[PDB]
Design a protein around this ligand. Structure first.
Ligand SMILES: O=C(O)c1ccc(OCc2c(-c3c(Cl)cccc3C(F)(F)F)noc2-c2cc[nH]c2)cc1
Length: 240
């Protein structure tokens, strides 16, 4: 029941931090930006779209930090290792969480209260990155990832004892092994082990996140946003 308790704990942390309810995202699928509304977004300054998107991504990261803080044993890791794991993994989790807000039927994402295609983001002038994020979301949406699958998979995106610069690798390994057992137990109970072969390959999430954060750092150098900093030790690693 330790592993059953861990599944319950991880799913509760996820529910408390997931931002939007799945049934709300699903109900809103017929609420699509009009041609007029899309043109309104396209005419916005690159720098206004950056401010909006940077705000949304900052809030998304903060919810992921709250998710990690509520994972059994995470707060018992040394601060160095908590920061190493969050710096490496929190934006990877944001990118995975996006698949819930993605509709593969019409290739739209839930953004500021309605669904829109990647054309909504034209003003940012990084069509290749936006295309890559949509493609990644399309790949995960095809799995029909359940809420518990997202919760347990994203716990494992964070709790990775291979991250360079960990000081207590054995302690991270112990948490990782328990979360791997929780995920694999849960897939067996729900007859969903078939998704293991279909999950993103080794390096796909890492390289997408590298490209994404590189672009956020370029925008932040050119046009810095003001962050409502909730996690000073982590903020200090990302901002300068
Ligand atoms: O509340 C906080 O204390 C806090 C700390 C870090 C943080 O990091 C966001 C981030 C960004 C990012 C974002 Cl989301 C928007 C604008 C600019 C940036 C960037 F690139 F300049 F940092 N990019 O990656 C992260 C991140 C955090 C952990 N792992 C990656 C937000 C809030």
């Amino acid at each position: 029941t330790e592993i059953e308790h861990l599944v319950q704990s991880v799913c509760k942390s996820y529910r408390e931090t997931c931002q939007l309810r799945l049934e709300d995202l699903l109900r809103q699928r017929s609420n699509i930006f009009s041609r007029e509304e899309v043109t309104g977004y396209q005419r916005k300054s690159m720098w206004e779209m950056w401010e909006r998107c940077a705000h949304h991504l900052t809030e998304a990261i903060q919810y992921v930090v709250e998710f990690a803080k509520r994972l059994s044993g995470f707060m018992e890791l040394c601060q160095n290792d908590q920061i190493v794991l969050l710096k490496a993994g929190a934006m990877e989790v944001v990118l995975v969480r996006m698949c819930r807000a993605y509709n593969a039927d019409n290739r739209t994402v839930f953004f500021e209260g309605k669904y829109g295609g990647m054309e909504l983001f034209r003003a940012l002038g990084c069509s290749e990155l936006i295309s890559s994020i949509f493609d990644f979301s399309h790949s995960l949406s095809a799995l029909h990832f359940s809420e518990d699958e997202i919760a347990l998979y994203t716990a494992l995106v964070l709790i990775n004892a291979h991250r360079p610069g960990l000081q207590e690798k054995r302690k991270v390994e112990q948490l990782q092994y328990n979360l791997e057992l929780a995920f694999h137990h849960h897939l067996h109970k729900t007859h969903r082990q078939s998704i293991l072969a279909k999950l993103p390959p080794k390096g796909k999430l890492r390289s997408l996140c590298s490209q994404h954060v590189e672009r956020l750092q370029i925008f932040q150098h050119l046009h810095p946003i003001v962050v409502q900093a909730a996690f000073p030790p982590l903020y200090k690693e990302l901002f300068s």
